[model samples]
Structures are given as C-alpha cells and as structure tokens.
Target: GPAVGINLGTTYSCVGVFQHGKVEIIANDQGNRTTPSYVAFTDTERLIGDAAKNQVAMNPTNTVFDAKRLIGRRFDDAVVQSDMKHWPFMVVNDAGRPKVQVEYKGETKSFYPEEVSSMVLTKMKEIAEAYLGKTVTNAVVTVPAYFNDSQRQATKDAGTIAGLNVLRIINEPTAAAIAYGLDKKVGAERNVLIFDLGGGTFDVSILTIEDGIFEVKSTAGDTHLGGEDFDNRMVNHFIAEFKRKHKKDISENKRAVRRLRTACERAKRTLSSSTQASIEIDSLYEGIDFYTSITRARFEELNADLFRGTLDPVEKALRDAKLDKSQIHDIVLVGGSTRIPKIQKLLQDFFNGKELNKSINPDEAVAYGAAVQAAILS
Candidate 1:
C-alpha cells in the first residue's frame, strides 16, 4: 500500500502521489485532474464528482455542494446563514450542527458535512488507487490555515470515515510553499508569501524558509470567498440579460439558472486567457438559444470588488507576520482561481512589480506538496 496526498477542496478535489522522487498528480476516472466536490443521491445510488455536478440542475434539491463551508460550523454561524441563502439544496439545523438533507434510497436522508466530505475523499481514494495500482491507506490532506481546532478535527473525522489514516493536515499555503521551495532549491533564507485562491475559499499566508524549514508566520483568509463567488457575478448579469430579451424572470427556474451558472463559469475560465469569451446555449429557455459574448474587461468589472478584496487577507497576513511587503523575497500563487488575469495583476501591483512565481501548476501545487509530505511520513 502507498500513501497519497489530497487537496480536499471546497469545490474540487485533487490527488497526488510521490514516486521516483517526484510528485505526479493523479487524474480521476474521467481523465480530469481535479474532481468537483459535489455529491448527488438518486433512488438507489450516490453520485460523486463530475457525475453529480453534471446533473445538478435536474436535481438541485438533492445535490450537495460546498460542504466545506458547513463542516464543523454551528447552524447559527453568521457566515453559514449568509451562504445558505444561495444554495439550491436544503441545510437544516440538527442540534447545533448543519445537516444536508437529500433524497436517497427512496426516502429523504440527512447527512452531516463530514459525511458528505468523506464521500468526496473516498472518491479521491478510488482515483488514486486506480492510478497507483495500490491501496491508499494513509494520506496527508490540506486545509485552509485559518481553520480552527474543531474544523481541523472535523476534517480528520471525515478522513477517518473514508477509511484513511490521515497522516497530517497541512495548511494549504504551507503545502504550496513546500512544493515551490523544493522545486526551486532556494539556498538562502527568505520570507515568502503564498496566496491560495481556490474554488470556494481564499487563503493567504506569510512564511519563512531556511535550511529545509517551512514555517508559516501568519495566515488569513475568507472561507466563503473564491472563484464561485466571482462566477455568480457573471451569472447574475446574464440572468438580467435573459429577462430583458424575453421579458421573463428565470429565477423561478432552477434549470435555467444552473445552465447560466455553468456557462458563465466556462466563460470566466476562457476569459482568463482570451480577451473575450462566448456563451451559447441551445434552446436555453422558452425555446430561445441564448448566445452572447462577454469581454474580459466586462468580466473583471463585474467582479471588481471581489478581486480587490483578495488583497485584504494578504495585507493582514503580512501585518501579522510583522514584515513589510518588500521584505518578502518570493511570492507563490496556488489554486485554480489564481489563473485569472486581474487577480495576478492586483497582486503584482501590491508587491511593487515583483514577478509572481507561476512555476507550479495552481491546481496541482497543494496536492503535490502534500504528496511530498506524505512521502516524508510514510
């Protein structure tokens, strides 16, 4: 059996393995490097990953997404109550814990956030097992550095339920820095800042590296801020466009809304590398094929405030680390959301024109670093 590393993200999961002295990210059954952290329940079976995400519109109430936001948080948490308003599925208070209620096995069933998270972990395990050709019994998983003791413990609980002997729970940015530090072989001691903006959470940490030591000096992040929040900005704009064209509100239609959501996400990704992106749908609503385009400038404008807010955590982390911005010798970017052009631009400006290191693949860095840690443990 071989141990693996997992970035059990809020919106997607990535697995990595260290063999032959290098880390290789493992793709899921669908040949995708990252798997969506979504779970769906039908009359007789449970669906995870892309399978679940693909059918979210048809089964909005039965699809569970963003369990990371709810895991280990009390039902009355201000953040939880605020985020709950946007979810299509139901989250009910069970004692003080938040429970996701979905239809399964011909009846409605309530599942804790840990249970839902465990299912995603199990899927990651299966993907690793299939690719590695060995059983994966132990794992070094990553979490946001700001997660408290209860949240960290709850993550371990999910790993336990998934049958993994969780070797260690490393901070996401610490993991990213390790991957960067090991690959670059930087000899001198230096202060480094790692900014991780993933699918559903934003994390920034200031760390010091010297003579093989990786220490996080300070960390700050928003659990609810990430790429999905940006996507919603475009989704809302499109919803308004549909109304103007058809003179009808699609708010009452989950299918239409989810369609726009997915389309907007794709466009956002496209706009990262292109000046503009087209969003086309066939018979989208009321037999009208909605076809349109959005410029990258427009997309950035729609999410201008959110992109600006990403820096607040970075500023706080630096302040907590008691270091000036120029004191940092290197800056590493991690997570899929960092690919956005404006995000990089703002961060670059903040650092006084310092070139942000894009050496590691944002989607693979955290998991790869965790895999290196697992190699050390195993």
Candidate 2:
C-alpha cells in the first residue's frame, strides 16, 4: 500500500500519493486534481467539493465555505465578528467556540468545525482509496504555518474523524520547501522566501535549504487575507455601481451577492491574462441589470492597498529573520492567489529584479511534499 498526503486548505483541498519513487496527485471522480473545500447539505443528501461550490448561490444557508478560518476560534473573536457579516450561513457559539448551524435533510443541525472539515477530508480519503485500490488509513496533513496550537489540534481531530490515522500535521510553507528541495542539486544551499496566498488566508515564510534539510527562519501573515479578498474587492465595486445605476442595494441579498462572488472570481482569473475583463450579470437585483468592466490597471488601482497589504507581512518576516532583501537567493510562489500578476511583480521588484522560482505547481506543491513526508514515515 502507498502512503497518502492531504493538503487541506481553507478554500481548496487535494490528495496525493507517494508511489513509484514519485509523488502523484490523485484526481477525483470529476477528473479534477484539486477540489473546492466546500460542503453543502440539501434536503436529500450532503455534497462535498466541486458540487457544493457550484450550488452555493442557490443553497447559501446550508453550504459552508471558508470554515477553515473559523476552526478552533472563539465566537467573539475579531475574525469571526467580521466574517459573520460576509457569511450567509448561521454561526453560533458552542462552548465559547464557533459552531455552524444549518438545516440539513429537513432538520436543523449544528456542526463543529472539525466535523465540517472531516467531510472534506473524507472525500480526499475516498479519492486516495479509489486510486490506490485499497483501504488507506494513515496519512500526513498540512496546515498553515501560523495556525496556533488549538487550530493545529483541530486539524488532527478532523483527520481522525474522517477515519484516518493522522500520522502527522506539517506546516504548509515547510511542506512546499520540501517539495522544492526534492529534485535540487546535492549539497546546495539557498535562502528562499515562500509567499503563500490562498483563498482565505495568507502567509510568508523565510527558509534556508542546505544539504537536503529545510529550516524555517521566520514567518508572518494575515489569516483574513487571500484570493477571496481580491474577489470581494471586485464585488464591492460592482455593488456600488449597481446602486448608483439601479438605486437598489442588493448587498443584503444573499443570492445576489453569491452570483457576484462567482463573477468576481471569474473576472479575477481573466484579468490575470488579459488587460481587461467584463463583469456582467443580468437581473442581478430585482430585474435590474448589473454590468461593469474592469481593466487590469483599474484592478491594480482599486486593490493597490490590498496588494501592498501582503508586503507588510513580507517585511515583518524579513525583519524577524534579520535578513535583508538582497540576502534572499530565491522566491517561491505558493497557492492560487500568487498567480495574480500584481503579486508576482510585487515580489519581483522587492527581490532585486529576480523572477520567481516556478519549480513547483502553486496548487499541488504542498500536497506533494506531504506525500514525501508520509513516505518517509511509512
């Protein structure tokens, strides 16, 4: 039997295996190597991954996304206070920590964060099982570097609930560095900066790789920042425009905001390759047409603060490591948000005009590294 690795992220999840002397990502039944970290409960059944993501607009109340941010957190936490406004699903306090409440299968049910995460983990386990032709049990999981002790323990509990023997919980950035070092030259020494911006969280870690060993020097990030923030920025622009033209404030409409969220994500991806993109949704608010166009320049201008927001942690990480920008030999990009051109350029300009190291896939690198670690343990 092969060892399995899970990269359980805030907005996405993936499973990989160490086999044939290489790490291979296992695709789901949908033939997707990556799965959305979403779960939805309908009257008839529960949905996970891509299915839940696609139905979120219609089933906003029962669909849970961004649950990772709420895991092991108190209900009165600042992050939860802000998140309550954005989340259409109900959030309540259970023993001082946050719990998600929703109607599932014609009954109201409450869930702990670990339970929700377990659903996603179970799906990943199924993928690995189908691919490996066996009932796999033990696995390695990755978590954010800045995740506190409670959050780390919650992730392990989630895995245990999913019926897997949780072998280890590794830091995400450290896992990526391991993947980066797997095929490098022997005895090579390099100072690397890993900039990881995912859907719902962000982090920067400074690492030193020498003689097949990876060491973390410093780390910093905002748990509230990522690609979703970029999407929300676009959504806000559209909402303001709709109000000016149609005089309707659809911001309070969950379905309307959900549609806009989807469009904003599409536009964000399109603008990455094109100079301009259109955000159009017919009958967005009470039969009012919602239409707008955003250029790359405008996006950069609108999100200038958010783009620069990532740099604060970068500077903080560098300061903590006591290393100047010139001392860094390589910059490694991780997570889907790092694909944004503005992010790429910002890192490039900061690191003495050097291009980012693209040795690993932004989405799969962490899971691949986790597989390597799982192999070592097995």
Candidate 3:
C-alpha cells in the first residue's frame, strides 16, 4: 500500500500521490483535480464532491458544504452561532456540541462535523486509490496554522474514519513552504512569509528556510476572513440590486440565495483576471430574469476594507517573528483566493514592492507538500 497527501480544504479537497520520486496530484473520477468539499443525502446512496454540489440548490437542506468551520466547536460557541446564519441547513445541539441534521435513506439523520468531514476525506481516498490502481491506507493531512488542539484532533479523526493511517496533521502554511522549498531545493537562508488565503480561512506565517530546516515562526490570521467573505460582498450587492431593478426580493428563499451565491462567486473569480464580469440567472425571482455586471472597480470598492485588513496579519507576523520586512526574501502565495489581483497589489505595496512568489499552483501546493511529507514518513 502507498501513502498519500490530502489537503482537505473547507471548500475543496485534493489528493497527492508520490511514487518513484514523482509527485502527481490525483484527479477525481470525474476528472477534476480539485473536488468540492460537499456531501449530499439522497434517496439511497450518499453523494460527495461536485455530484453533491451540482444539485445543492434543489437539495439545500440535505447537503453540507462548510463543515470545516464547525468541525470542533460546541453548539453554543459564539462562532457557531454566527456561522449558522450563512448555512442553508440546520445545526442543532447534541448535548453541548453542534450537530448537522440531514435527511438520509428516507429518514432523518444527524451528523457531527467530523463525520461530515470524514465523508469528504473518504471521497479523496477513493480517487487516490483509483488513480494509483492500488490500495491507499496511509496519508498526511493539512490544516490551518491557527487551528486549536481540538480542531487538529478533529481533522485527524476525520482522516482516520476515512480508513487512513493519518500519519500526521501538518499546518497548511508550513506545508506550502515545504513544497516550495523542496521544489526549489535551496540551502540559502531566507525569511519567507507564507500568505495563505483559502476558501474559508486565512493564515500567515513567517518561516526562515535553511538546508533541511524550516523554522516556522509566528502565525496570525482571522479564521473567518477569506474568499468566502469576498464572495459574500458580491452576493449582498446582487441581492440588493435585484430589489432595485425588478422590485422583487430574491434573498427570501434559501434555494435562490444559494444559486445566487454560486453565481456571485463565479463572477468574483472571473474579475480576478478580467475588468468586468456578469451574473445572470434565468429566473432569479418570480418570473423576472436577473442580470447584472460588476467591474473590477466595483469589486475592489465593495471589498476595500477586507483587502486593507490583509495587511494587519502580515504586519503582526513580521513583528512576532522579530524580523524586518527587508530581511524577507520571498512572499509566497498559498491559496486559490490569493489569485485576486487587488490582494496581490496590497501585498506588493506593503512589502515596499517586493515580488510575490507565484511559482507553484496555489491550489495544489499544500497537497504536494503533504505528499512529500508522506513519502518521507514511508
């Protein structure tokens, strides 16, 4: 059996396989390299990945998407209380812990966040096995650098329940740095800051790189600040615009809002490399078709505060690491959301025009590093 690396993200999951000193990120059965972190309950069999997300609007309450936010929290935790407002499904209290309620097998069934996360991990395991055409039992997984002990434990348990050995749980920023360092094969000492802004979480860590040594220093970030929040800015604008233009409110229905969020998210992604992007829904409310466009200026204006706030963590990490900004040699971007041009500009200006590293695929760097770690463990 071979070991693998799994970057079990909040919005997407990916698997990496290292064989014969070659690293290959294994695509899912449907041929997508990045799998959505979604699980759905159907009449009979459960569904995972895009299959679950594809029908989410039709099956909103039965599908779970952001289990990473709730993976190790209590029902009465302040964060869970606020986080539930964004989800379509219900979160009920099981004793003091939060539980996700879903309809499964023609009956009502509830799941813990860890259980839901395990279902997602199991899908990644299935894909890796299929890609290898062999069994896979051992794996290394990654999490946010700011995850608490219980959260890390929750992630490890999810991997174990997926039938994996769960070799180790590594920090996402650390994993990204390792992948970059190994890919570069460097012995020169350099202070590198890993700025990881993923779908649901943000992490910044400063690490000094040397031969076989990576001193990962202070880390700082807001767990809730990331691309999901950026997407919400667009979602709210569209929701308000629908009222102004068509005099119909589309935010009342959870299903409609879900679809709107997906469209808005797509538009935000589009604006990353384009000046303007449009969001069109055939039937957004009643019989009215919804069509609107946002320019790069509007997108940047809407998220002005968020883009500015990104600097705080970078400043904090440097202060805690006790290193001058000039001493840093590389600024590595480590998540899909970092592709946004505005944030790139903010980082560039804050570092006094230092070049940011975009050498590796931000989406796949964590998984690649995890696989490299798995190979060493094996």
Model 1 C-alpha lDDT versus the unseen true structure? 0.89
Judge candidate 1 at residue 235 and give its lDDT.
86
- Roughly what TM-score does model 3 have, to 2 decimal places? 0.91
lDDT of 1 by residue, 1-378 (tens): 778999988889999999999899999878999999999999878999999999988888899999988888899999889989988889999999899998898897999999999999999999999988888999999988778998999999999999999999998887887787543446777788888888887778887877777777988888778888888999889989989988988887778888999999999989989999999988888888899989999999999999998988988888989999889988989989999999999999999899998877898889989999899899
Off by over 4 Å in 3: 182-189
Which residue pairs clash within candidate 3?
A: none
Candidate 1 has what TM-score?
0.93
**Taking the tens digit of each residue's C-alpha lDDT, what string does model 2 give over 254-357?**
78998998998999889989999998889888887777889999888888999987888999999999999988887888898887899888878877689787
Clashes of 2: 0
Best by lDDT: 1
Q: Which ranges in model 2 have alpha carbons more than 4 Å from their true place?
A: 74-86, 182-189, 211-213, 243-249, 288-292
lDDT of 1 at 172: 84
lDDT of 3 by residue, 223-249 (tens): 888788988898888888888887878
Ranking by lDDT: 1, 3, 2
- Candidate 2, run of 10 with poorest lDDT: 180-189
Best by TM-score: 1
